């Protein structure tokens, strides 16, 4: 009943540096605002990340498979630079997957986010800032370092990848993620 | 499985 290596998750050949502080298990979700699989997975991974608390260091990395969606990576880091990510992100997803507003340009984003209480001037500055440009370029470099081919992909301690591509279900992805983190904590992975 | 990948 336990997840099968090479089937339910992938043991990476070139594991990556881990920024978690020893006690914690690192968890990275490669996601994309426009992926409906990452959209439906948002409440499941959220609640779980909060359930682990001090036991993990969770972070997200936006994925842009084509230049069309680089603004979605700039959007991710522009909101974080403002500290409004956790507040507006539910509205971002819903705008894309229910309101037929895909937020593909900085102007459309500044327009939408202003209805959510975000000052247009301050958002566009972060969007065009060199710091957000650098975070976007780094996220694309992480895509290659982690050999990410699809989303949502979850990486545990920079060694093990899982996701619906492996498990064929979001619930199965959550179960695998939970299994891997525990195996890490027990020095079995 | 399934995922957004391209």
Numbering used by the authors:
A (entry chain A): 9 to 197
B (entry chain F): 99 to 104
From the study:
The oxidative folding machinery in Gram-negative bacteria typically comprises a soluble periplasmic oxidase (disulfide bond protein A [DsbA]) and its partner membrane protein (disulfide bond protein B [DsbB]). In B. pseudomallei, deletion of dsbA has marked pleiotropic effects on virulence.
BpsDsbA in which the buried active-site cysteine (Cys 46) is mutated to alanine (BpsDsbAC46A) was incubated with a synthesized peptide of sequence Gly-Phe-Ser-Cys-Gly-Phe derived from residues 99 to 104 in the predicted periplasmic loop 2 of BpsDsbB. GFSCGFBpspep makes contacts with each of BpsDsbA's four catalytic surface loops. Its interaction with BpsDsbA is anchored by a central disulfide bond to the active site, and the flanking hydrophobic pocket contacts both Bpspep phenylalanine residues. BpsDsbA-GFSCGFBpspep superimposes on apo WT BpsDsbA with an RMSD of 0.3 Å over 189 equivalent C-α atoms, and the catalytic surface loops are equivalently positioned.
